[PDB]
Amino acid sequence: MILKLYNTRTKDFSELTNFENVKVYACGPTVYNYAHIGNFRTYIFGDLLIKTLRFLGYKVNYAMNITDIGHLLTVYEISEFFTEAFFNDCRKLNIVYPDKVLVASKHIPIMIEVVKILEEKKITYFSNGNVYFDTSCFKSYGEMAGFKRNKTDFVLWFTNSKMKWDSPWGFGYPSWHLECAAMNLEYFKDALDIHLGGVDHIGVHHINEIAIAECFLNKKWCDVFVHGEFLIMDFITVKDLEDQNFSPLDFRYLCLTSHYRNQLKFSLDNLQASKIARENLINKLSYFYESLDPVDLNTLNKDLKNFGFSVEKEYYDSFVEKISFDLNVAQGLALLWEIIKSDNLSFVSKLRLAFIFDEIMSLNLREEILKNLQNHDVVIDENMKALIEERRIAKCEKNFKRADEIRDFFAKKGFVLV
Ligand SMILES: Nc1ncnc2c1ncn2[C@@H]1O[C@H](COP(=O)(O)O)[C@@H](O)[C@H]1O
Ligand SMILES: [Zn+2]
């Protein structure tokens, strides 16, 4: 199945036919303070996307920059501290770690080498202490969106008389536009496939990257640009959300029930609905899982997408169809709830689909079911009294394999045997 996504460059869905090696760049955070949940809506978006490509069978190499420069103790200690915390918040929200993290301060050579090239193509100029890119040397500029020579000219390199680097234009630092563009060009070379960000990058930052890269390359760069819509509040960090007694994954759930091209109206009340819906999901799945016999239970340890019933495959394909049309994970979730409540599926089938959909949803369902069950009370009914005999016998016949298999059945339901 081919992923179809909404491409801002062309205002229609682009088809993604190249399964062998798709390259994805996402603008990363500023690292001068904790990121807020608005930033994480967008990172959950990148996550949903890479996870969907992978789920659909694409091999993805995904890169993210970290801007650790000087917004517009050691500056490095600070940005190092808020770098670890960002990725710590990421782990709390089950956001896949990029395959490559490109740190602006570690890639100044390529940035300088891209300016050198642009200057030799007569595209640049120096004014008021800065090297500017001259956008009129470039008829196409900004078609994706709609002391300077032109309003929309942009800085490439900042200089000053007194974090700083030497250059052919003097000591200075790059603009954020040149960091994103140059780093892509070094890491992915002439060949980005999908470039992500928030909608606010449409009208300045992304078109600026494009200008840099396509003038450098002297050709088409990066066919697909995908943008996520804003999270709107009446800004909040994850700590704030933990401190008000929410769980990170509650915000995750909330991000899941809304397509990436919609604005998300955030509130405590909608976060609360998400917390309850996520809580019921886990409780319902826990009842299903508690109720299993050894043969059904072993089946979920195994190859999940090896379906035992056509009706599972049906729901799997209905799922694929949904996510493959433009990252519609919200309809995926909707589908899981149809599945949970369904009377044409056994308990074991519902869990299989849960565990498969969770490869995208990333709610820790498996491990949330084990935690939920470890908190109910012990009730030894007959079917349990008998596995123990089966076990006490097997441990006497000295068939420790069977004994350990029984043991490992109780453990997966949260029981220990002493
Ligand atoms: N309220 C918001 N909702 C969704 N994404 C946002 C919001 N604010 C910032 N972003 C995105 O978060 C990423 C980094 O944000 P910043 O570090 O503030 O530049 C960018 O991709 C932004 O477009
Ligand atoms: Zn960027």
Residue numbers in the entry: 1 to 72, 92 to 165, 183 to 198, 204 to 275, 286 to 469
Task: Give passages from the manuscript.
Aminoacyl-tRNA synthetases (aaRSs) charge tRNAs with their cognate amino acid, an essential precursor step to loading of charged tRNAs onto the ribosome and addition of the amino acid to the growing polypeptide chain during protein synthesis. First, the aaRS combines the specific amino acid with adenosine-5′-triphosphate (ATP) to produce an activated aminoacyl-adenylate intermediate which reacts with the appropriate tRNA to produce the aminoacylated tRNA. In general, aaRSs are divided into two classes based on the global fold and sequence conservation. Crystal structures were determined for a CysRS from Borrelia burgdorferi bound to AMP, GluRS from Borrelia burgdorferi and Burkholderia thailandensis bound to glutamic acid, a TrpRS from the eukaryotic pathogen Encephalitozoon cuniculi bound to tryptophan, a HisRS from Burkholderia thailandensis bound to histidine, and a LysRS from Burkholderia thailandensis bound to lysine.
The B. burgdorferi CysRS structure was solved during the second round of crystallization trials for this target, as detailed above. The central catalytic domain of CysRS is quite similar between the E. coli, B. burgdorferi, and C. burnetti CysRSs catalytic domains, although the C-terminal anti-codon recognition domain adopts dramatically different conformations with respect to the catalytic domain. After determining the structure of CysRS from B. burgdorferi, initial inspection of the electron density maps revealed two strong difference density features. The first difference density peak most likely corresponded to the catalytic zinc ion, as inferred by the E. coli homolog and which modeled and refined appropriately. The second strong difference density was supportive for an AMP or AMP-containing molecule, which resides in the same location as the A of the CCA tail of (site of acylation) in the E. coli CysRS/tRNACys crystal structure. Due to additional residual density off the phosphate of the AMP, it appears likely that a mixture of AMP-containing compounds may have co-purified from the expression host or represent a mixed population of degraded or disordered ATP, which was added during co-crystallization. Attempts to co-crystallize with tRNA mini-helices containing the CCA acceptor stem were unsuccessful.
